[PDB]
Design an enzyme around this catalytic site. Sequence first.
Site, PDB file in Angstrom:
ATOM      1  N   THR C   1       0.825  -1.200   0.000  1.00 54.94           N
ATOM      2  CA  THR C   1       0.000   0.000   0.000  1.00 54.94           C
ATOM      3  C   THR C   1       0.861   1.253   0.000  1.00 54.94           C
ATOM      4  O   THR C   1       1.984   1.240   0.506  1.00 54.94           O
ATOM      5  CB  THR C   1      -0.947   0.040   1.229  1.00 54.94           C
ATOM      6  OG1 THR C   1      -1.967  -0.953   1.084  1.00 54.94           O
ATOM      7  CG2 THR C   1      -1.608   1.395   1.369  1.00 54.94           C
ATOM      8  N   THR C   2       0.339   2.327  -0.595  1.00 52.64           N
ATOM      9  CA  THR C   2       0.852   3.669  -0.347  1.00 52.64           C
ATOM     10  C   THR C   2      -0.314   4.645  -0.292  1.00 52.64           C
ATOM     11  O   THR C   2      -1.128   4.704  -1.219  1.00 52.64           O
ATOM     12  CB  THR C   2       1.856   4.127  -1.412  1.00 52.64           C
ATOM     13  OG1 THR C   2       2.736   3.051  -1.759  1.00 52.64           O
ATOM     14  CG2 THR C   2       2.686   5.290  -0.874  1.00 52.64           C
ATOM     15  N   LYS C  33      -8.883   2.808  -0.628  1.00 49.60           N
ATOM     16  CA  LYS C  33      -8.178   2.918   0.638  1.00 49.60           C
ATOM     17  C   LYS C  33      -8.266   4.307   1.252  1.00 49.60           C
ATOM     18  O   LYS C  33      -7.737   4.517   2.349  1.00 49.60           O
ATOM     19  CB  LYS C  33      -6.704   2.537   0.452  1.00 49.60           C
ATOM     20  CG  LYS C  33      -6.468   1.244  -0.320  1.00 49.60           C
ATOM     21  CD  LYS C  33      -4.974   0.957  -0.478  1.00 49.60           C
ATOM     22  CE  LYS C  33      -4.732  -0.277  -1.338  1.00 49.60           C
ATOM     23  NZ  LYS C  33      -3.313  -0.729  -1.284  1.00 49.60           N
ATOM     24  N   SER C 141       3.798   0.508   2.627  1.00 42.50           N
ATOM     25  CA  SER C 141       5.061  -0.073   2.193  1.00 42.50           C
ATOM     26  C   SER C 141       5.782   0.788   1.167  1.00 42.50           C
ATOM     27  O   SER C 141       7.002   0.671   1.026  1.00 42.50           O
ATOM     28  CB  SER C 141       4.829  -1.473   1.623  1.00 42.50           C
ATOM     29  OG  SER C 141       3.708  -1.498   0.758  1.00 42.50           O
TER      30      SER C 141
END
Lengths: 222, 222, 223, 222, 223, 223, 223
Positions: C1-2, C33, C141
């Site tokens: 994810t970012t 997200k 991440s």
Amino acid sequence: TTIVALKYPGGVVMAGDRRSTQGNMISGRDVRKVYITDDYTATGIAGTAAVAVEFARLYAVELEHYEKLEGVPLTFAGKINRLAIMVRGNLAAAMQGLLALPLLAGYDIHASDPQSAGRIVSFDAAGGWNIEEEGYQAVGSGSLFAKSSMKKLYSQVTDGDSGLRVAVEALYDAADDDSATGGPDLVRGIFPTAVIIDADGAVDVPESRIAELARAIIESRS
Amino acid sequence: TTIVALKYPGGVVMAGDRRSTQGNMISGRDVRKVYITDDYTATGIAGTAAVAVEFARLYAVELEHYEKLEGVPLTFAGKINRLAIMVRGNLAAAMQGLLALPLLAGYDIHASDPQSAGRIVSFDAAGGWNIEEEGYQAVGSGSLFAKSSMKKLYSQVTDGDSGLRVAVEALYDAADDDSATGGPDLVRGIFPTAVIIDADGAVDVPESRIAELARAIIESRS
Amino acid sequence: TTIVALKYPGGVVMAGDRRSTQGNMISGRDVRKVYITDDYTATGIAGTAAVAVEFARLYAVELEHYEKLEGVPLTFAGKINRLAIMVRGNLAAAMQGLLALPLLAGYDIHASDPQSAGRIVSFDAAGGWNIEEEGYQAVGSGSLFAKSSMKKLYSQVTDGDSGLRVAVEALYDAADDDSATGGPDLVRGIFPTAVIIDADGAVDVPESRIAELARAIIESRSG
Amino acid sequence: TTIVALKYPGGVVMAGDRRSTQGNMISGRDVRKVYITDDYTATGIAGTAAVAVEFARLYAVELEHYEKLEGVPLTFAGKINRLAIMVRGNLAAAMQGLLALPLLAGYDIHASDPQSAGRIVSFDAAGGWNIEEEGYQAVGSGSLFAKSSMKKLYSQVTDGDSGLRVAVEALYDAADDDSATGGPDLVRGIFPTAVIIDADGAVDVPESRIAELARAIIESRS
Amino acid sequence: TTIVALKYPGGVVMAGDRRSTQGNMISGRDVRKVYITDDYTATGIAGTAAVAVEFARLYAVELEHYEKLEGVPLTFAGKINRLAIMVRGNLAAAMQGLLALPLLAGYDIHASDPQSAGRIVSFDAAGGWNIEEEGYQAVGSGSLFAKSSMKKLYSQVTDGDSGLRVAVEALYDAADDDSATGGPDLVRGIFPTAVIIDADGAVDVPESRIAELARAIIESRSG
Amino acid sequence: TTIVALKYPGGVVMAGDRRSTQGNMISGRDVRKVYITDDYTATGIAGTAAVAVEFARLYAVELEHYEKLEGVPLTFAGKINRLAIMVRGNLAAAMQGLLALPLLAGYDIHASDPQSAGRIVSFDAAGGWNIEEEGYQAVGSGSLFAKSSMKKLYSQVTDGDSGLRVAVEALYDAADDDSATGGPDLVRGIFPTAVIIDADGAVDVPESRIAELARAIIESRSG
Amino acid sequence: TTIVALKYPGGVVMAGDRRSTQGNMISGRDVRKVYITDDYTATGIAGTAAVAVEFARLYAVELEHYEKLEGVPLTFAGKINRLAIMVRGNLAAAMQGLLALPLLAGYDIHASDPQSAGRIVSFDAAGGWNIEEEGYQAVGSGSLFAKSSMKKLYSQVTDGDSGLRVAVEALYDAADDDSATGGPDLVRGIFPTAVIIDADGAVDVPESRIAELARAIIESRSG
Ligand SMILES: Cc1cc(C(=O)N[C@@H](CC(=O)N2CCC[C@@H]2c2ccccc2)C(=O)N[C@@H](C)C(=O)NCc2ccc(F)cc2F)no1
Ligand SMILES: Cc1cc(C(=O)N[C@@H](CC(=O)N2CCC[C@@H]2c2ccccc2)C(=O)N[C@@H](C)C(=O)NCc2ccc(F)cc2F)no1
Ligand SMILES: Cc1cc(C(=O)N[C@@H](CC(=O)N2CCC[C@@H]2c2ccccc2)C(=O)N[C@@H](C)C(=O)NCc2ccc(F)cc2F)no1
Ligand SMILES: Cc1cc(C(=O)N[C@@H](CC(=O)N2CCC[C@@H]2c2ccccc2)C(=O)N[C@@H](C)C(=O)NCc2ccc(F)cc2F)no1
Ligand SMILES: Cc1cc(C(=O)N[C@@H](CC(=O)N2CCC[C@@H]2c2ccccc2)C(=O)N[C@@H](C)C(=O)NCc2ccc(F)cc2F)no1
Ligand SMILES: Cc1cc(C(=O)N[C@@H](CC(=O)N2CCC[C@@H]2c2ccccc2)C(=O)N[C@@H](C)C(=O)NCc2ccc(F)cc2F)no1
Ligand SMILES: Cc1cc(C(=O)N[C@@H](CC(=O)N2CCC[C@@H]2c2ccccc2)C(=O)N[C@@H](C)C(=O)NCc2ccc(F)cc2F)no1
């Protein structure tokens, strides 16, 4: 982190660095670790950030709570005891990695000699407290460098300004030897924070004066 | 630690910081982590210091040993392989805490196009080696910060001077976000080290030029 | 994810990728997200999908709960404290693998200066919070890649358009260096999600605008 | 234990405390921890006593051995390398609690500048070695305190005598903050040991001079 | 730490050192380890500073609580029992590292022979208690050196003065052989503390008196 | 520790040594391990000092508590069962090192034949009790030396004085072969303690008598 | 065990107790722990009996081996080194429970003046060694008590005879405070063994003189 506290004639001074880390990585450059917990008390915590912030906030609330319920502020002794009890409450989480050690500095409006009404109290993870009767003290990963520096510089302390300068220098040395303690950042203009406490209470030291002292120290070591 | 290397037209440049830690404590301020391992190759290592120094010294001795025994230097592939083997041999100790990863920069005198005869080779703890084709690379605790810096700055490299500039700035961002990587010390006059290699060989970049670049960067970010 | 978030003159922008993984396997390509958690705040979470979704849902419910019970919305500080408490509560589960870190972007209608009323707040697993005073932040991440990207691009942020561009590009660099962050998928027409917040509230960014920005970034990197 | 070493114009000085412990129990009061390892170098060790004595004795034997086999002594670099090799060789035992770290003070007869011919080299448990450029250094459970003391006192070193005084004071501060480092014992008349090295060689500092200096420090701090 | 206590004709004396440590590092130089816990008792404690201070404080409070509730103070056996119970309650924490052992000196007003009304009680981690019938006792990391010293010195105790001197010399031997016990500090003027108890109660020995005895002992050892 | 108990015509005798240790270190030379728990019973305990003393004290309180509540003292079987229940209740702590085993000696006023009215009951860590039909028993680390001694000497018991003597000699052999059992100390005049019970109740044996018996045994083994 | 050694003007004396244990069980009453390892040196070992006896035997053999091979005895420093190397060599077994620590007492026929030629050297499990310059040393489970005893008694050492007295009294105090060190056994006529070394070499002290001293010490402590 490094927090320093020292006594000067008629009051006390506490300063803290601005750095926050996650292992080797820098996670913060402007964190404020010294809190004015009441009119005559400042607290400076080192360790896990969440636990430190919670400590400062809850502690201040508790002191003012007693003050409003009973119409009178706790004696300084009672303040020490409350802080230590709080630290002892967190011992298990501290074993699990969420460790936070505070350092207390205050001015006791009920002490006998107003020139020596300044107070500096250390704590450990068990909630044990000790009132420092030698003028200065430090806490954090740079606390030994700051204490050994102050051991040599303390004889220059004769008033508020000299005490502030020695505090900022001790933070400078702590940061010089401890990568977890941030020194002055001249690019960004972020300098340690400071609280000074005397008969008129606890006041935030203006950034500008701290910056002048830092630049003076820097230029002196060149 | 942070070591960076990047290719510029007809040459390569490698630079490294000067910091040494024992956990949070700064154990060294003037360490050299970039060794000229032969007339056309430099090595920079990150990790356990005792291991890295031994890597540099033994590697240099092995390349020159082959040169004197056989009257001719190893081909670049040979140098790669010998370094990879040396790293692989240290895997057990590296698992037991004595880890050290090297980065290799070189100028292949046997390349066809002298414009791209530069070489950058990165290694992992198991002896894996990879010849980098995208221009730059970094090893150490700051290497991700430095790589992401060079990703944005690399298009400005057109010669040795701009390559040296991008290298020093990459080390600057590294130090900026990693406490285990050291930034320029204007008080003490200590700056990263740099080796530059072109067709006339490998040579140490003098301190004053790196100091100029560092002061330019610091002045720009203010 | 970012997840990335950043301030711009008069507002804030937050954007997040669309990837969902089970180790190396890709289990989702269209995950949302980044959630509008109230009229002036968005929350983007990275971590165990279930815990992230639950966090966003319960958090939005909580803020609206206070607002209706008391007739007035919580101060921004209150919102921070509440998100931090919710994260602290999950620490025990996080130690066993149900870990979720949020990132909070919001406009504070009670701030003095309306052009610097944007707010970026980051958290850690222990519930610590920090109000970011350098204008950009990221979590997940890919967050180090995206942060080091924005560290170079942030001088280009002068309005909402520029800020959105910088944010999408930061997610692009993240996806470029981190396999757990999904880049633009031109074949399927799936692009990162984004929210923009200013004095007039928080609005979702249409997918087509992120599409335009993604194509610009790609063609730029191509030549 | 604390061992200190500092450079002065034209030489180097080393000094160590006299304390031996078994946990909390004091098992030794007159331990000699600083050894003249050859006509121009002295080594001082901290850690497990058996290992420390072994290191000093064996290292001395090895230097003189080379000298008699080869008609000429090792270059200072060679001496550093041999000591580091020994230390690395003890690394497994050290991992099992048989830890011992040396500090090396030397005078390089082959240095160009006779004024800056002093050498101070510190080591780590892996055999890493580092030549100190900033003038002083220490090792042992009190090394941090001594180093921070010398940070403030070093500007007073102008000759062999002032350097000796600074060394003894650094040991005094170590003993002050560290129970594993012994202070001057006025009742028994036991004081730190010291070695001084210049162009004429390395010689033991007579106990009387150290007694005088220690008493000056004691009186001063009263 | 080292706490000593011993009986003399007509009373008892207790004395303690001043050092505080964190591993090898000295963390305290003026710590008070011997407390007047009521008009006729003195508790000294070795162990974790937090636990020690809480023990003295809570014990004193409990004794006075009984006294004010019931109009009369506890019997000495009652005091022993309360302290033993307090020590036993802390056993689990003790095994976890928060160990603290007290030593108790007292003058029993209800004893038959006032000249022998002095009492010394030692304790162990499980709460076991023993009334010492050989005249002296000690607790802490230097307690064995102290007791072996008092074995040779004890025949010199005929009154309170000799008892005080023997106590200070025992602490001297303790610090002499125990890096965790602090000897006299002639530079800073810090000396051990002491409480003396007879039929007139328990009083703190003034610092100057302990300083005189310390100087005399040191001169003796020097010549 | 060694406690012994043996039956003689018309009564029973129990005796115990005086030593307390911490590993190899002697921490007590005058410890009393044999308690008169009621007019017609004495208990002697081996193991952890704090637990032994707690057992004795609590057991006396229980027996007298019943006697006062119900107007009449428990039957001997009742006393056995309460002691056994107390021991069983401590089995977990005994498992974790707080182990203490008692040994009961009594005189059953309700027995038919006053010549055999003596009683000796031994226990184990799980609460097991056993009434000893063969006239003597012991407990502690020296118990096997004491029982093997009395196996040879018991036939010489015809009254309280011979029974007492054999008990003291049993303890003497125990101390001679077991370091955690204390022999008589003639330098300090400390000797094992003894309680004797007949129809007139249970009484402490004066130290003088035990001392003479001890000296007679010592000389009888000197030649 | 307790072994003591002290310097007297003109020589050195070593004394050792006679006890052997297996846990709390006394397994030996006549052990000889102090061996004349050569004309001018004695060695006393504490620890596992088999390892100690092996050490004494093999060390004596080694010294005499060198002496016959080279025509001249080792220097005292050499003797030290060989013993230390032996200990260091046994470190691993020592950690498996086969631990033995020696104490060396000798007379250096090569010292400048013969009144201070006495040498006392202590050792640790790692092979470390220390020449004691304070006159006395002890090793074993009772060495702390013995050392703190000699700390007070050592001023009375003016020749060999007073040296032996102080050594025997140190052993007596050790046995007084340590159950693993055996005191004088007046019933069986067993006393510590002792060696005295002067310029005329090493000699065993006759049992009768040790017994004399022991009885004097006892009749002094008792009155
Ligand atoms: C469990 C666990 C621990 C951590 C952890 O290491 N958390 C870091 C802090 C951190 O990365 N983040 C990022 C988001 C908000 C939070 C932050 C809060 C406030 C300020 C700066 C950051 C820490 O606690 N690091 C320690 C080593 C530290 O630097 N502590 C300095 C400090 C002292 C006093 C204080 F009041 C605040 C401080 F940050 N995370 O999960
Ligand atoms: C096992 C073990 C590990 C260590 C350890 O952490 N040893 C440290 C180094 C250290 O404290 N000392 C002090 C005396 C000499 C040695 C030093 C050597 C060379 C330069 C500066 C110091 C380290 O290795 N730290 C690592 C994390 C580090 O900082 N590494 C940087 C580095 C990279 C490449 C290189 F060639 C030299 C370097 F110092 N010690 O024992
Ligand atoms: C315990 C445990 C954990 C997992 C696990 O790893 N479960 C995966 C998720 C997954 O495979 N599936 C398949 C169906 C439902 C669920 C999903 C939910 C929502 C969206 C997409 C998928 C995960 O949690 N992966 C993590 C590493 C991840 O990719 N997280 C990205 C993410 C962040 C925030 C958010 F709100 C939603 C997200 F998917 N399984 O058991
Ligand atoms: C395994 C193992 C470790 C130890 C242990 O802790 N052994 C102690 C030393 C000790 O008790 N004894 C008593 C008999 C000889 C030996 C001694 C040697 C030399 C000098 C004085 C005594 C130690 O090593 N302590 C360490 C922590 C220490 O004090 N180290 C200081 C020191 C540094 C350098 C040096 F050369 C000598 C020193 F004593 N024993 O077994
Ligand atoms: C868990 C855990 C243990 C410790 C720890 O080792 N804490 C140390 C004490 C310490 O460093 N600090 C620093 C500030 C407060 C506290 C202090 C309190 C009161 C007086 C002096 C200091 C300790 O407990 N050390 C023990 C070994 C000790 O020194 N004990 C001596 C002592 C006896 C009785 C007494 F009342 C006070 C004492 F300090 N901390 O967390
Ligand atoms: C856990 C833990 C265990 C111990 C421990 O071994 N504590 C020792 C006893 C001890 O050192 N001290 C010191 C002061 C108070 C206490 C004592 C109490 C009463 C009488 C004499 C001393 C023990 O229990 N040793 C056992 C092995 C022992 O010797 N037990 C003999 C005994 C039996 C019955 C009895 F009633 C009293 C006794 F002492 N301490 O913490
Ligand atoms: C493993 C292992 C350990 C033991 C063990 O405990 N072995 C005991 C010794 C023991 O029970 N027996 C019985 C028969 C022979 C042997 C003995 C030898 C020589 C003298 C007297 C007896 C011990 O070593 N006990 C230690 C604690 C001890 O008492 N050590 C005193 C001592 C010191 C030096 C010396 F030379 C002889 C000694 F006995 N056995 O196996």
